[PDB]
């Protein structure tokens, strides 16, 4: 349960980072 919660939160954090990065690239 602990491992699965950890890897789930990291994947969400990486998805938010990708969302933020894509935003920046679209701003050129
Ligand atoms: Zn978050
Ligand atoms: Zn994307
Ligand atoms: Zn922007």
From Swiss-Prot:
Tissue specificity: Most abundantly expressed in the thymus. Present in both B and T-lymphocytes. Highly expressed in HEK293T cells and in insulinomas. High levels also in spleen, ovary, muscle and lung, with highest levels in muscle. Lower levels found in brain, colon, heart, kidney, prostate, small intestine and stomach. Weak expression in liver and pancreas.
Compartment(s): Cytoplasm; Nucleus
UniProt PTM: CRTCs/TORCs are inactive when phosphorylated, and active when dephosphorylated at this site. This primary site of phosphorylation, is regulated by cAMP and calcium levels and is dependent on the phosphorylation of SIKs (SIK1 and SIK2) by LKB1.
Record family assignment: Belongs to the TORC family.
Subunit structure: Binds, as a tetramer, through its N-terminal region, with the bZIP domain of CREB1. 'Arg-314' in the bZIP domain of CREB1 is essential for this interaction. Interaction, via its C-terminal, with TAF4, enhances recruitment of TAF4 to CREB1. Interacts with SIK2. Interacts with 14-3-3 proteins, YWHAB and YWHAG. Interacts with calmodulin-dependent catalytic subunit PPP3CA/calcineurin A. Interaction with COP1 mediates nuclear export and degradation of CRTC2.
Primary role: Transcriptional coactivator for CREB1 which activates transcription through both consensus and variant cAMP response element (CRE) sites. Acts as a coactivator, in the SIK/TORC signaling pathway, being active when dephosphorylated and acts independently of CREB1 'Ser-133' phosphorylation. Enhances the interaction of CREB1 with TAF4. Regulates gluconeogenesis as a component of the LKB1/AMPK/TORC2 signaling pathway. Regulates the expression of specific genes such as the steroidogenic gene, StAR. Potent coactivator of PPARGC1A and inducer of mitochondrial biogenesis in muscle cells.
Name of this protein: CREB-regulated transcription coactivator 2
Species of origin: Homo sapiens (Human)
Gene (UniProt): CRTC2
Residue numbers of the full-length protein present here: 20 to 47 of 693
């Amino acid at each position: 349960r602990k491992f699965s919660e950890k890897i789930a939160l990291q994947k969400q954090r990486q998805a938010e980072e990708t969302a933020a990065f894509e935003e920046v690239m679209m701003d050129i």
